[PDB]
Write a protein that binds this ligand. Structure first.
Ligand SMILES: *[C@@H]1O[C@H](CO)[C@@H](O[C@@H]2O[C@H](CO)[C@@H](O)[C@H](O)[C@H]2NC(C)=O)[C@H](O)[C@H]1NC(C)=O
Ligand SMILES: *[C@@H]1O[C@H](CO)[C@@H](O)[C@H](O)[C@H]1NC(C)=O
Ligand SMILES: *[C@@H]1O[C@H](CO)[C@@H](O)[C@H](O)[C@H]1NC(C)=O
Ligand SMILES: *[C@@H]1O[C@H](CO)[C@@H](O)[C@H](O)[C@H]1NC(C)=O
Ligand SMILES: *[C@@H]1O[C@H](CO)[C@@H](O)[C@H](O)[C@H]1NC(C)=O
Lengths: 105, 226, 224, 229, 128, 105, 105, 105
């Protein structure tokens, strides 16, 4: 429901803020492909970093303010879409929060 | 002080197609002036060994012999011995290797199983199995190809032959492979090929994709007063 | 001198409910009137070590020492010590075995697959496959129960946990059950119960029948 | 001159029993003939048995086979069948050495199902295997079903031929005739291609009735006379 | 002496997945005695002889007196968005009209869906 | 439409009488399998004698009385069903005349 | 297609005669269950003897007269039905010859 | 599959012989109502004796010869039909053995 509408710059890094829920172990930052109604997991607690994002992203969880932060290092035109974050085994039936990304260059 | 001898192996013979036989010597001190030679069933001259290996991590010497043979005389069941003359041991160490035969020779049966849908929900990866059953003897080979180019061996993994509870002496094996569901939900043939001696061409393969079911769904509409 | 101590395995513990540990003495001659005993960290005593293994005809000696304990003592970090005395080796022998602390724990994922259509076309037999993946460490116990009654252990084959190719530290295993096609076609239900020490109740069961997974064919729509 | 057929790929792959055969032709029938195979290295070569018969048209024919290891032939070493005749004291040399160099053009294999315009006639279902793109011009197609190769006599194939596009390519053909009923009842009838540039030297494709995209039915029955035309 | 039966086949489904070209095959069987040749015309304009490659008459697997021949042709993959139907033809003396033009198009072939829409009415007698 | 209801004896031979039409070259004596609604050609002018009937049947055409006669030599229980004869490239569309066969032994 | 319909007596043994074809390795003596249109393999060259027939049946092949003989030892009311014999991987698409069995007691 | 075709007399008692299988705890002697394709459990190891048969039937299991015997005391015309015996939770999907009963009076 909520949209951070996070913004950033080409290069550098940008931090995505998403809520960390309880009674849900798998936490993911899925990317809304919006092609054939399918969303592909970019990162997860089960340890799966997409090949296109390998070595550029990380996921750190700390239940201090009930928040988990995901950082994306570097930036490319490809990195300018929707990255719905959520929990649960089914990736398409989670997406608790929706966010948008772009590039300023 | 024991010498391990490796007879020609089906996996290497089918993969490299450069059939080699090699026996290595272990539990020997790091010495020199030691020669290694091979002998056939008649003890004939052989080829010079190459690619001398380095000593073991526990400070003991190691060496490997090299020679070439042919299937037409290996399959006869004749023996093969490599002559090792260690300086410490006055009596040379000789190890004999031979080709066993007489086992049943039924053809392996190959089936592929598509990934389960409850795995195809978390959207990270999927596993494909290639079940090879009812084949004797052992020493079968399996590899996976994607549109002609074989997959990197670091990706898939294979089991080892094990007996069949409902068959006397007939073995059984598995093989799995992991691909991203994203790639899976687009398209690829993902061929599984098995190389066994009992097959008429020694090679068979069976391939499966995401669109291998869907038995003609039907939509009926009883339009009335509309 | 070679004496083997086998720490209890989770598969054996779940299979027998009678957790046991064995101090196997080998690399010795077939000598009788041996003395073997199990002692705790503080030097206490245990129950009698009955059922001593018979000597082997290949000039080797076999002896086993069994200490009946509960599971909380073993899994609480307490360390055991085996005592072995012999005429050939009068010096006492001590061995320490315990849980290897310092490993992460993860829960397996179970996927049960139906037999191949081509295998069914033979109209003879059928094989159900159970795929357990992603569990760490490697101590999984797999069993098959048809109608609440476990099938003969000689009917199925289970694989040793081989490391997951892409996931370091995690493992996977397979279990295949060979049944008759006639039984499978009559609606017989089979399930794959798997026991791991990371599952919430340490038990998890997945089932499969001939109608499991079959898709919808007709889409009738009554429009008025 | 005494003919000597070099081992073709169709011969070294069919029975996996590669052998050397030299046939005496265009000569006169006489006895006291020594036929064997010689080695450049000089190693002993087994003399081929099973002498041929005599041509009724006053011609000599001598045939035989000698078992070798295919690695020696693949290495490139020559083979010579030395035939000595009483009327021709000069020995005849038949250099049977494989040519060096292999073209880099794996073959692509495509299949085509029989036309329904022939199925309704219910006479025979002809399946074609369009081997295309192999270089050099050497291919050994075989049709197999039920786990055994169907007697090659039931099928026919064609020799390699050029293309009007790209430098270095060859194409082939194959036809298998099976009664429509048997084709409709079942039977996959896979096709195989044996070219010496494949990853495992063997590649195969397969077709059947249901090899196409599944077709859905959008039936739209209407019982209201008011609705519709 | 029998009528020379002829057939035509479209390019393979898996062939239309590399995006290089496509082949169309016209099969000619029978024609006893063996007297045939094929000319591949499109829109009534004969194509270049370098495109279609006819080979020879060959006896049928079981040949009392029958024979058969095969002839293919190479096109471009990107041209099949319009079809052009790439007509085939055969000629023989044992034919009343000595021509049996045979042609197929992307549209002709296997139907991938069957949208049947039957209706019931008591006023269809005339079938206007 | 018409039925000869031809009858015969085990062994020997029996002649099937069927009309020889004009403007139709392919003439066949199809056997009504009546299994999945499919009829298999036993003989044809295109030269196709089923394997089970190989060397036992023949087809002779002579437009004297507009009749073509087909003879079946030998006889087996299998030879006791319907053999619809017709013309045209399509087989399950012709079947101009229907006939029945049996065995007397 | 042919029906040996070989008979027998309760107890003892009865021999089933079936044709041994070539270019077909798997040879079976399937039992026509005729329940839901399914036939269950009683014996095969792949080595599968049904539990109800375990230790009572055997299959011997010898291409002398192109015949393979199957013997059934003992006899029960259950042993009084159809045992279509054939070849090929698909059991229901073979059944080259059909036979019937009964009991005389 | 097997039929005892057990017979008896009006009054007295009759014993029904049925096989006692292993790995199946629930053992029942269902009565084939054959009305709307439904079979009603007469007795079971779970302890359920139909009201019409209350106090007249018993079930004793003893794995000596792998047999469990069920005795029916008294007899009525109603007691003259099919009593398929079997095992498993689903009563209609068991019926291992079929038997028939009648009355002689
Ligand atoms: C709708 O159709 C069903 C199926 O025909 C009917 O179900 C049957 O109902 C009768 C009693 O009315 C039973 O004897 C049958 O056993 C039922 N069939 C099955 C398969 O169980 C149903 O009754 C129909 N609905 C109405 C209102 O008549
Ligand atoms: C199914 O039928 C309904 C009613 O005619 C129609 O609206 C719908 O589009 C159909 N679905 C498909 C996939 O054809
Ligand atoms: C099934 O029918 C419903 C209602 O007509 C329709 O919305 C839906 O699309 C249909 N399913 C498919 C796969 O077409
Ligand atoms: C199904 O039929 C409806 C009505 O004609 C149509 O709108 C719809 O597109 C059809 N679906 C398909 C997949 O053809
Ligand atoms: C299906 O048929 C209906 C009725 O003719 C038509 O309206 C609809 O457009 C058709 N659908 C397709 C996909 O052709």
């Amino acid at each position: 429901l909520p949209e951070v509408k996070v913004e950033g710059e080409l290069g550098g890094s940008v931090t995505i803020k998403c809520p960390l829920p309880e009674m849900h172990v798998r936490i993911y930052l899925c990317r809304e492909m919006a092609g054939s109604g399918t969303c592909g997991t970019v990162v997860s607690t089960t340890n799966f970093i997409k090949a296109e994002y390998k070595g550029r992203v990380t996921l750190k969880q700390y239940p201090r303010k009930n928040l988990f932060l995901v950082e994306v290092t570097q930036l490319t035109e490809s990195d300018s879409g929707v990255y719905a974050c959520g929990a649960g085994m089914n990736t398409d039936r989670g997406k608790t929060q929706k966010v948008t990304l772009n590039v300023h260059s | 002080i024991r010498v391990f001898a490796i007879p020609p192996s089906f996996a290497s013979i089918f993969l490299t197609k450069s059939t080699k036989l090699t026996c290595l010597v272990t539990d020997l001190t790091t010495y020199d002036s030691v020669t290694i030679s091979w002998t056939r069933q008649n003890g004939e001259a052989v080829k010079t060994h190459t690619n001398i290996s380095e000593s073991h991590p526990n400070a003991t010497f190691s060496a490997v012999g090299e020679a070439s043979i042919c299937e037409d005389d290996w399959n006869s069941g004749e023996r093969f011995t490599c002559t090792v003359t260690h300086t410490d041991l006055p009596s040379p160490l000789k190890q004999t290797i031979s080709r066993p035969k007489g086992v049943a020779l039924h053809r392996p049966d190959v089936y592929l199983l598509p990934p389960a849908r409850e795995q195809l929900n978390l959207r990270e990866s999927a596993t494909i199995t290639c079940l090879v059953t009812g084949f004797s003897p052992a020493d079968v080979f399996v590899q996976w190809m994607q549109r002609g180019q074989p997959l990197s061996p670091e990706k898939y993994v294979t089991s080892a032959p094990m007996p069949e509870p409902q068959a006397p002496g007939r073995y059984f094996a598995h093989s799995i492979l992991t691909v991203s569901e994203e790639e899976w939900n687009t398209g690829e043939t993902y061929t599984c090929v098995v190389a066994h001696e009992a097959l008429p061409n020694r090679v068979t393969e069976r391939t499966v994709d995401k669109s291998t079911g869907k038995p003609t769904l039907y939509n009926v509409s009883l339009v009335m007063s509309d």
